[PDB]
Design a protein around this ligand. Sequence first.
Ligand SMILES: *[C@@H]1O[C@H](CO)[C@@H](O)[C@H](O)[C@H]1NC(C)=O
Ligand SMILES: *[C@@H]1O[C@H](CO)[C@@H](O)[C@H](O)[C@H]1NC(C)=O
Length: 92
Amino acid sequence: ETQECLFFNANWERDRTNQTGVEPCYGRRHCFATWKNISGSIEIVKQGCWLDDINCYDRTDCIEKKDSPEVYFCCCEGNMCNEKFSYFPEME
Ligand SMILES: *[C@@H]1O[C@H](CO)[C@@H](O)[C@H](O)[C@H]1NC(C)=O
Ligand SMILES: *[C@@H]1O[C@H](CO)[C@@H](O)[C@H](O)[C@H]1NC(C)=O
């Protein structure tokens, strides 16, 4: 049930991609986000489709449940589901 995702690439200039947009998923499809979070300050690394087989923490919402990771990651199902992404560590 995922055909398209929010696209973001902080390395767009060297990678020769758009900086942002809508990615069409081809290649079960998912969307994902990866980000840094230092003392509450969030920096997106990438957003887009995720095509390899994977399991996510929530079906609908993009959520990271690992505890204090250096690079945060989430995946989700549903068109544009990765526009919102949250941190709910298992330790809570
Ligand atoms: C990149 O932006 C172009 C328009 O300039 C659009 O046609 C394309 O689908 C976009 N792709 C991504 C992955 O954002
Ligand atoms: C970022 O880290 C702060 C704590 O320093 C936490 O309250 C917040 O949930 C985190 N947000 C994301 C999107 O990772």
